[PDB]
Amino acid sequence: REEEAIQLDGLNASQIRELREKSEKFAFQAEVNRMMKLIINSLYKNKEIF
Amino acid sequence: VLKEEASDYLELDTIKNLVKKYSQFINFPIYVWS
Amino acid sequence: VAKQRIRMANEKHSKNITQRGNVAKTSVGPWLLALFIFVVCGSAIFQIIQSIRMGM
Amino acid sequence: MDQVMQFVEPSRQFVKDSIRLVKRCTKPDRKEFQKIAMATAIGFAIMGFIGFFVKLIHIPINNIIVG
Amino acid sequence: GLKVGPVPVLVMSLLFIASVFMLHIWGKYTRS
Amino acid sequence: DVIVEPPSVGSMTDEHGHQRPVAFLAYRVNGQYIMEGLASSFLFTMGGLGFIILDRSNAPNIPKLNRFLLLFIGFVCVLLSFFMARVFMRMKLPGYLMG
Amino acid sequence: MAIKFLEVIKPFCVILPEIQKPERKIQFKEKVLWTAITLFIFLVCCQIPLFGIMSADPFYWMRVILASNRGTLMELGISPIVTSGLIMQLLAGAKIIEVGDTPKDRALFNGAQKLFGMIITIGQSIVYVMTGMYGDPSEMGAGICLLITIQLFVAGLIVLLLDELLQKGYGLGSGISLFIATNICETIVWKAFSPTTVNTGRGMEFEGAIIALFHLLATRTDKVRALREAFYRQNLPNLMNLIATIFVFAVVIYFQGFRVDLPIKSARYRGQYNTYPIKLFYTSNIPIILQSALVSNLYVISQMLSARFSGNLLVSLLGTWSAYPVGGLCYYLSPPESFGSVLEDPVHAVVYIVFMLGSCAFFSKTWIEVSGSSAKDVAKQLKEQQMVMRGHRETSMVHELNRYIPTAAAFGGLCIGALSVLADFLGAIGSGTGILLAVTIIYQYFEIFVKEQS
């Protein structure tokens, strides 16, 4: 209960938690993104790397 | 001797974009015809 | 006024015999009118344009 | 600047006209004014609350209707 | 241009409001 | 609300991320948000009034048009108020009345 | 010409449905109830969200609904209908459009304007879908876009019928006028008592001014510091903003009563005395609408012109854009942002105030001729009524009205402008023009009550 009480002239405990969660969680999603491309791609078909 | 599908690569902008995309970190200077 | 016009109008009325019950009964600033038109039309057109601009 | 001086004469006269119109028009009396004030106040509150409640109810419904 | 009684207009209005709620719920179920 | 000072609406997240506002406090019966509590309370009052207006409608010496109109309002308030309340709880507790 | 059009449109006009005539007069309990049902159904519809709203960040349109009205079913609302009405009136005043005096011709004219409003709604909806404001048209799909357009179109059509029913006499007054008043009053109450708490970077605060005062007082040990914040908090609705609003109402009520009444009598029957009233705000809110429209129209052209031709000296001279015009004539037209700024640049403040009053007064007088409410039109209307002034010949009556009608219109334009300027500086919630509509509509309903009590 206390972790969500509106705090005037202060930052709510819940809010800070959410914030960092976004940073860490968002980055983790990027790892899935990278693997998705590598596997789901066709490299040589889209061989702009030439 | 590029293929017909590779005409886009022949474009001056396209080659420069590829150099920035992949070869930007090459130590030696890279020159593109202009 | 020339008296000659008395006879002139008399013959005209004589013609009415053929034009029965069909005789012709008779015989706003310009700048302001234009000014209002763009104001009312402009508001509608501009409101549409502004909505697209605000989204864009 | 000639037009501005010419305008001054119309400027004064219609100002005189306004004063005459004020004198002729009926002026609401204090006692009747109180009656209007209560009537408007009651209508304002009664009508306004209907908007207030309907808006409040909708907000939870919005969550359910769309995630 | 048909002349319509006031009460018929009320019922038609309500049906339209009901339909919109049905469409939203149908949208979630069809997605799910 | 005064003692616990909960927010009007909270926030949630998903794999797509981003902060959903929340109106209903899920899975705890003794916790609520400001908006949710007032919305539920209004329904309870409305249901009670619907009966009283229906009772007044039954009085004699009322016109045909007045009597029909009053009855329609009475049933609408009673039925919507009761039915809606069940939906609100069903969302708050997913297993409500489920067996 | 226009009559020739009317016959051409006549097959189109027939399709539009019309409300039934009330067979007999409705008693008061019934009289009130019909309006109330109309009010609730419209009010609920205004907040219903749309379907297939799509949206990068999902749940964007979710957060949008809980704040403003953007994205709701009634977003088009009354704006299409009113535009149709105003344009039709202007054409008649121009005389480019000709309306037959006979009842059948006038009925066709009413049918035409209703149809014209319908056309406006379709065009406005189509533009929004094309602009992709909701989302990319390709992403939505052909089926979704068509359905969304259908939803708005029916929303406009239903509004027309509800307004017509109020005019027909089932419910007192006109539906559209009541609807506009309803939201304005709703805004005042919502700001005062809204419990939603919005998180500012420093801290979360309650939207409601009264709610904010109570919460702030308890939380803070120092009462004096809390009290000052509640009264003069700039970010959120102030306590002072409400007190200004109440003061503005008092002024509007007192002035609204002002009118001049001219003795009139029926020629046919002796002993019958009636007075024809000319109100002080004879023009009504129309002048302010025109003046604001012109300023907005000029602003849009000036800002757009700057982008296309930044180099041109002329575009900069009229206005320099930073969008707010920092300098130039358009900057002078802009209202002063703050009282402190006005002190900083008195010449700018004086120019804006003088222009604001002058523009309204001039527009009101010119509007009368195109409006059709001129003294010449008034006299002819009385003749059909068969009611004439007492003690004067018919021709003389026109001169007698001309004594009062022109002066009233000019003064009314000045007065309406004066209130509008006054409202912003005080900071009272809501536009001054809105305040007049609320009091006027409420008072008309009150007058109807008086006969009923008998």
Swiss-Prot record, chain A:
| Name recorded for this polypeptide | Endoplasmin
Query: Which residues have a glycan attached per UniProt?
Result: 12
Domain commentary: The SRT pseudosubstrate motif associates with STT3A during translation in normal conditions, preventing glycosylation of facultative sites until HSP90B1 folding is completed.
Q: Where in the cell is it found?
A: Endoplasmic reticulum lumen; Sarcoplasmic reticulum lumen; Melanosome
Question: What is the recorded post-translational modification?
Answer: Phosphorylated by CK2. In normal conditions, the OST-A complex together with CCDC134 prevent glycosylation at facultative sites during protein folding, thereby preventing hyperglycosylation.
Q: Which gene encodes it?
A: HSP90B1
Similarity field: Belongs to the heat shock protein 90 family.
Q: Which organism is it from?
A: Homo sapiens
Where are the Phosphoserine residues found in this chain?
14
The entry describes its oligomerization and partners as: Homodimer; disulfide-linked. Component of an EIF2 complex at least composed of CELF1/CUGBP1, CALR, CALR3, EIF2S1, EIF2S2, HSP90B1 and HSPA5. Part of a large chaperone multiprotein complex comprising DNAJB11, HSP90B1, HSPA5, HYOU, PDIA2, PDIA4, PDIA6, PPIB, SDF2L1, UGGT1 and very small amounts of ERP29, but not, or at very low levels, CALR nor CANX. Interacts with AIMP1; regulates its retention in the endoplasmic reticulum. Hyperglycosylated form interacts with OS9; promoting its degradation by the endoplasmic reticulum associated degradation (ERAD). Interacts with CNPY3.
Curated annotation (Swiss-Prot), chain B:
What is this protein's function per UniProt? ATP-dependent chaperone involved in the processing of proteins in the endoplasmic reticulum, regulating their transport. Together with MESD, acts as a modulator of the Wnt pathway by promoting the folding of LRP6, a coreceptor of the canonical Wnt pathway. When associated with CNPY3, required for proper folding of Toll-like receptors. Promotes folding and trafficking of TLR4 to the cell surface.
Record's protein name:
Endoplasmin
Q: Write out the PTM section of this UniProt entry.
A: Phosphorylated by CK2.
Q: Where does it live in the cell?
A: Endoplasmic reticulum lumen; Sarcoplasmic reticulum lumen; Melanosome
Taxonomy, top ranks, is:
Eukaryota, Metazoa, Chordata, Craniata, Vertebrata
Q: Which organism is it from?
A: Homo sapiens
Entry remark concerning the domains of this protein: The SRT pseudosubstrate motif associates with STT3A during translation in normal conditions, preventing glycosylation of facultative sites until HSP90B1 folding is completed.
Question: What family does the Swiss-Prot or TrEMBL record give for this protein?
Answer: Belongs to the heat shock protein 90 family.
From Swiss-Prot, chain C:
Location, primary (coarse class): membrane
**Polar residues composition-biased segments:** 16-27
> Where does the source fall among the domains of life?
Eukaryota
Q: Mind telling me which GO cellular component terms the entry cites? A: cytoplasmic microtubule; cytosol; endoplasmic reticulum; endoplasmic reticulum membrane; ribosome
Q: Tell me the compartments it is located in.
A: Membrane; Endoplasmic reticulum membrane
Chain positions covered by the region annotation Disordered: 1-27
For this UniProt record, the keywords arranged alphabetically read as follows:
Endoplasmic reticulum, Membrane, Protein transport, Translocation, Transmembrane, Transmembrane helix, Transport, Unfolded protein response
The Swiss-Prot or TrEMBL record describes its family as follows: Belongs to the RAMP4 family.
Q: What is the lineage of its organism?
A: Eukaryota, Metazoa, Chordata, Craniata, Vertebrata
Its recorded name reads Stress-associated endoplasmic reticulum protein 1
* Membrane topology of the entry: Single-pass membrane protein
Q: Where are the transmembrane segments?
A: 29-49
In which organism is this protein found? Homo sapiens
Subunit structure of this entry? Answer: Interacts with SEC61B, SEC61A1 and the SEC61 complex. Interacts with CANX.
Q: What does the record list as GO biological process? A: endoplasmic reticulum unfolded protein response; glucose metabolic process; insulin secretion; muscle organ morphogenesis; plasma membrane organization; positive regulation of growth hormone secretion; positive regulation of insulin secretion; positive regulation of organ growth
Q: Which PANTHER family match?
A: STRESS ASSOCIATED ENDOPLASMIC RETICULUM PROTEIN SERP1/RAMP4, STRESS-ASSOCIATED ENDOPLASMIC RETICULUM PROTEIN 1
A Pfam family of this chain: RAMP4
Q: Which cysteines are joined by disulfide bonds?
A: none
Curated annotation (Swiss-Prot), chain F:
List the subcellular locations: Endoplasmic reticulum; Membrane
Similarity remark: Belongs to the OSTC family.
Q: Which proteins does it associate with, and in what oligomeric form?
A: Component of STT3A-containing oligosaccharyl transferase (OST-A) complex. STT3A-containing complex assembly occurs through the formation of 3 subcomplexes. Subcomplex 1 contains RPN1 and TMEM258, subcomplex 2 contains the STT3A-specific subunits STT3A, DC2/OSTC, and KCP2 as well as the core subunit OST4, and subcomplex 3 contains RPN2, DAD1, and OST48. The OST-A complex can form stable complexes with the Sec61 complex or with both the Sec61 and TRAP complexes. Interacts with PSEN1 and NCSTN; indicative for an association with the gamma-secretase complex.
Give the pathway listed in the UniProt entry for this protein: Protein modification; protein glycosylation
Q: Please state what the protein is called.
A: Oligosaccharyltransferase complex subunit OSTC
Stated membrane topology is: Multi-pass membrane protein
| Keyword Membrane assigned | yes
Q: Which GO terms describe its cellular component?
A: endoplasmic reticulum membrane; oligosaccharyltransferase complex; oligosaccharyltransferase complex A
GO terms (BP aspect):
co-translational protein modification; protein N-linked glycosylation; protein N-linked glycosylation via asparagine
